[PDB]
Nucleic acid binder design. Structure first.
Lengths: 51, 51, 57
RNA sequence: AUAUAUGCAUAAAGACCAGGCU
């Protein structure tokens, strides 16, 4: 695609069934600098949603 | 032919969780009195007179 | 050890009571505040002790 | 001598159970 030149090796090419899984990067990215802490141990809480 | 040889979970449930085959079925239960009556009519001898 | 670990101290005659930091107050639903397992156990122990005293007298 | 108070602009549920993810 970049230069328009022929590829030296031929490519296997055809339709194939693919399915989308319920594992999305935007639902798994997590970061924390400072937030809520546990009442007992005063340590950061557990859970991406709970920061 | 009774459970799927390929489908099974991974981890602590590997091999302990099975899936029924497409043609598989489960027995419901039938009375045994007609069976005993047929056997007795067809010459079955009881255990009382067993020599 | 004479100074640190005396054998008769192995038998309990007085019970320490930890501060509420060890057993933080819990709230089952909003305004109502529950108690931890340690709080209930200490309450039961104190109830048993006062029962012992009141039945001994 | 003052004058009533008639007021409140953030608190952090945690422990268990089940099902999945690599």
């Amino acid at each position: 695609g970049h230069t328009g030149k022929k590829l030296m090796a031929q490519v296997f090419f055809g339709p194939t069934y693919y399915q989308r899984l319920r594992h999305m990067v935007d639902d798994k990215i997590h970061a924390r600098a400072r937030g809520p802490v546990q009442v007992l141990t005063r340590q950061p809480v557990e859970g991406r949603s709970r920061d | 032919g009774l459970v799927c040889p390929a489908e099974t979970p991974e981890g602590q449930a590997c091999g302990l969780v099975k899936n029924l085959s497409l043609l598989s079925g489960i027995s419901i239960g039938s009375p045994s009195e007609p069976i005993i009556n047929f056997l007795e009519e067809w010459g079955m001898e009881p255990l009382e007179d067993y020599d | 050890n004479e100074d640190y670990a005396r054998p008769e101290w192995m038998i309990i005659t007085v019970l320490p009571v930890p501060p509420p930091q060890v057993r933080p107050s819990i709230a089952m639903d909003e305004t109502t505040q529950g108690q931890d397992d340690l709080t209930h156990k200490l309450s039961d122990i104190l109830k048993a002790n006062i029962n012992v005293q009141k039945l001994e007298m």
